[model samples]
Target: AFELPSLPYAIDALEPHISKETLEFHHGKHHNTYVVKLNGLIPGTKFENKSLEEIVCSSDGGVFNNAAQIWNHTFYWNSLSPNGGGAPTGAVADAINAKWGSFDAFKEALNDKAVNNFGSSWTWLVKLADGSLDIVNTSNAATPLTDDGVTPILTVDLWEHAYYIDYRNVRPDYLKGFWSLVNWEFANANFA
Candidate 1:
């Protein structure tokens, strides 16, 4: 069984970039639903006593969807911060510069993939086994946690529900704001 993890910051902390109304629904309702569902589905099953990541990496169908979603949503929340944004520092910065030449180019690459990614999905900045960085997209409840030798450094939920209340149907508008809230420190820690 799994419990809904609380937001790292207050529900209203994200403001301007992500509204309280949006978090109210996205976290309070949407994320909570996944946690509840996973708890219900795991009882008396192979996943009964397994960790969230364990179930996410091993299960499929309903079990996988709920468990992975719980993990993804939690990661997405931590990927933003009220004090975030601006250029990144430390090793994560070096990796991004190495791969994309500049922070602006890296943002461009990530934004392009996120906007063009069809349907409900997530866009991520992930690290490979050799310590290189890349942007990848995962559809629905899919996540890089299940990908071999990949470590998710940062992510933005591309699902409409993530931004509909605040930015409406224009995903690019939502993405524009996402930069303002990117938790670069979190990315750096993950890169380490």
Candidate 2:
């Protein structure tokens, strides 16, 4: 029975960037539904009591949907911080520079993916198996975890439920606000 992880910061910590009301619904309600559904679906199957990642990698259809959502949402929350924003430092910074030439360029490319993703999906900064960085997007409940040669280092949820409460119909504006709250330290740790 997987449980929703507590957010590292207070619900109101993100303030003007991500509203407290949004967190209440997104984290408390939406994410909790996935956890409850995943727990219910797996109880009588071989996936019973399996780790969320294991279930996400091994299951399909309903089980896959819920478990992968659990994993993705968990990663999404960790990918943000109240103190987050600006550019990364250390090896992660160097890696971004190497891949996209400059940090601003990297931001441009990544933001493009999020803004133009077409529908419900996730935009990710992934470290491929070769240690090279790439920006990738996945549709619906899909996550980069199911793909080979990539490890998700950071993510932004493009789903309406993530931002509709706060940003309404202007996703690009929501995305613009995302930069000020990205947890670069988490990315650096993941990269290391």
Candidate 3:
């Protein structure tokens, strides 16, 4: 019952920043493996009938990764758009301002966490428990939903496959280029 999430742009779209080969393998093979495996593990189980998000928050290990990755990828794709980028300017921006003092501050916070995430993981822009937004990171497939006070809005997967083929190890440069693909409309909807 699982489905592989599609990328927002073409396999070559984020190229020179994120390679086409990487997207094909990551989205096609790796992500697809998870979907296939999840489907196998789900049938006849209690989680079989749950939504992706529900399965994501309640599962563990590979099961969690599969479900979470699908959910995360789905969000990640919509979190970006062809014309996205620049800066925050609306209610979401206000939330960012309130939480991190300024947009630049928020960027710094996001970047710092992205680079510091040990290994494969996700850097997130999550709404905290107090209704404030904050940038956060998690190892592997761990997501913010399980943690108290965090509702995810935007996330950048720092897992090597996410950027390695194009940027190699120069993640910061890739980070700089990310905004150009950000889906502000979806972010705005989240804020609204």
Candidate 4:
């Protein structure tokens, strides 16, 4: 019953760092496929009327995979912006400094995590129940949304389909470009 969420900016807006071609495939093809698959799986089932979050939190196996992928891809889209980039400010900045000592250090740590994450995973910056921050990596469709008290601030999709056309197998290069496109405002909103 779900639909693919629209990109926050025009497909061409994130050009160079993330090409319009990449988005056409990533958003139009990959993300849309997840929504279609989720819809196919949920008909007349207990999950038919459930919200995406509810399905993500409660389901398992194929249902969980499709639902969580839909949620994750949506979050991944919001986690970037054409006008985004530069360091964060406010509470998110404070939390990052407190957790990793500096914004640069936080980037390094997050890059390391994303770079090393095994096949088709996601890297997330999350806030704990105690207001602390941490980086988490989840393989496949696993997400912090399934965890009891973790709040995902931002995320980067590590699937090959996310960057294969743009960066090929150079995941580190993709991570570097991710910083240039990171939606810090979205992260701040999530942190709040």
Locate the minimum summed-lDDT window of 10 residues in model 2: 42-51
lDDT of 2 by residue, 31-66 (tens): 999999998898779998678888888989999999
lDDT of 4: 0.93
Report every candidate's CA lDDT: 0.93, 0.91, 0.79, 0.93
Off by over 4 Å in 2: none
Please rank every candidate by lDDT, starting with the best: 1, 4, 2, 3
The digit string of per-residue lDDT tens for model 4 on 93-137 reads 999999999999999999999999989999999999999999999
- Among residues 3 or more apart in sequence or in different chains, the pairs in candidate 3 whose N, CA or C atoms overlap within 3 Å are 79-183, 80-183, 129-149
- For residues 155-180, what per-residue lDDT tens digits would candidate 1 score against the true structure? 99999999999989999989978999
Clashing pairs in 2: none
TM-score of 4: 0.98
TM-score of 1: 0.98
Clash tally, candidates in order: 0, 0, 3, 0
Give me the displacement of residue 129 in model 4, in angstroms. Answer: 1.1
